[PDB]
């Protein structure tokens, strides 16, 4: 429970194919908490309890890369997946996932 | 320009250097008028939303 | 911000090279030309060297014309001045200037240059031995 | 190339009366209602920083007591109410030519 957030897990037994050789199934769950909110957890069993979590401030919204290509140090404002741009010029064809200005 | 004491070429100063003017500001217009701010244009979704 | 600092002059005796380099920052930099102009001691400013935002086509006073390499390196936001063949008179402060005409195209030897924008700290290069 | 001389060379004048400086060019700087000009001002031991921008408009953070006017080869800077801290040198610069030519350079000073 929390100030929005609130759902009942009702554990569930069954016999499932067996993934990494193991044959049980776990769901994993995650939520945000305003500051000066409170979360609980109550429960009787079934439950894997956080040890260590985060706290961020998210800056608007950027996106994510997956590529083979090692990072070094560079002030750049175009970032695709297989190198960057000058951004000096108003039309690329390098690729279409970019992020920045 | 060739006459009885000398020739060869003279450029034009005036007209060309408006031509370079207003070149330069039209490159400025082609380029710089296209603004730009930060997006994120990759998008990443499950099997169950195709 | 606009930052120019530029270093690597000291003492020299003549005819060995010396290289100096304005790294800049806080502003668009390729999109700009960059211009080299010194102070001789006692003297007044004069213009040294220009180059241009693709870095294609560069410019000479007339003084200096055939000795000197203006070089630019837009990927480390790096002006250079290879400086060779020196003599007695060379000796100035030496700075670095940005243009004012955004992203101007030079292309013969009397075009019209923009004014200098923003100054380097200064950096002595003497000639003495 | 193109050579000018500012006439008044280490003019002193005290605080806050008028200096005035010329500037004259050996041939016409303008082009199509545009001033080719610009002025610079350096102090002892800083880099000679931009004062007035195609002879009429002023760099963001200048103080208004700079203006400067002038047209075709005559141009002329002025200073309403000197301030102690404004000794320095004054610079012409026309950026006509490929070859940007500064001037000799004045001096001003208190009196």
């Known amino acids: 429970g929390s100030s929005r957030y609130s759902k009942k897990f009702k554990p569930e037994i069954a016999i499932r194919p067996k993934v990494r050789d193991q044959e049980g199934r776990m769901n994993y769950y995650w939520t945000l908490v305003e500051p000066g909110d409170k979360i609980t957890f109550e429960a009787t069993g079934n439950l894997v309890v956080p040890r260590y979590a985060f706290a961020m401030e998210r800056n608007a919204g950027s996106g994510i890369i997956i590529s083979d290509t090692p990072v070094h140090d560079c002030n750049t404002t175009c970032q695709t997946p297989k190198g960057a741009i000058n951004t000096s010029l108003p039309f690329q064809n390098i690729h279409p996932i970019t992020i920045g200005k | 320009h060739q006459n009885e004491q000398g020739s060869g070429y003279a450029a034009d100063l005036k007209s060309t250097q408006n031509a370079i003017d207003k070149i330069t500001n039209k490159v400025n217009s082609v380029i710089e008028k296209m603004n730009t701010q930060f997006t994120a244009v990759g998008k990443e979704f499950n099997h169950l939303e195709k | 911000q606009v930052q120019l600092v530029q270093s690597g002059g000291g003492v020299v005796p003549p005819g060995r090279s010396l290289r100096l380099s304005c790294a800049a920052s806080?502003?668009?930099?390729?999109?700009?030309?960059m211009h080299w102009v010194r102070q001789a001691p006692g003297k007044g400013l004069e213009w040294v060297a220009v180059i241009s935002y693709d870095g294609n086509y560069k410019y000479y006073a007339d003084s200096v014309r055939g000795r000197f390499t203006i070089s630019r390196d837009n990927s480390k936001n790096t002006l250079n001045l290879d400086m060779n063949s020196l003599r007695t008179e060379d000796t100035a402060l030496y700075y670095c200037a940005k243009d004012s005409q955004l992203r101007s195209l030079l292309y013969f030897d009397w075009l019209s240059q923009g004014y200098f924008d923003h100054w380097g700290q200064g950096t002595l290069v003497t000639v003495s031995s | 190339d193109i050579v000018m001389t500012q006439s008044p060379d280490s003019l002193a004048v005290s605080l806050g009366e008028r200096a005035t400086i010329n500037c004259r060019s050996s041939q016409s700087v303008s082009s199509n209602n545009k001033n080719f000009l610009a002025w610079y001002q350096e102090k002892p031991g800083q880099p000679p920083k931009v004062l007035i921008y195609?002879?009429?408009a002023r760099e963001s953070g200048v103080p208004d007591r700079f203006s400067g006017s002038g047209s075709g080869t005559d141009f002329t800077l002025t200073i309403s109410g000197l301030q102690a801290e404004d000794v320095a040198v004054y610079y012409c610069?026309?950026?006509?030519?490929?070859?940007?030519?500064f001037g000799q350079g004045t001096k001003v000073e208190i009196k």
């Open positions: 806080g502003f668009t930099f390729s999109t700009y030309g």
């Open positions: 195609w002879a009429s």
């Open positions: 610069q026309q950026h006509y030519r490929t070859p940007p030519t």
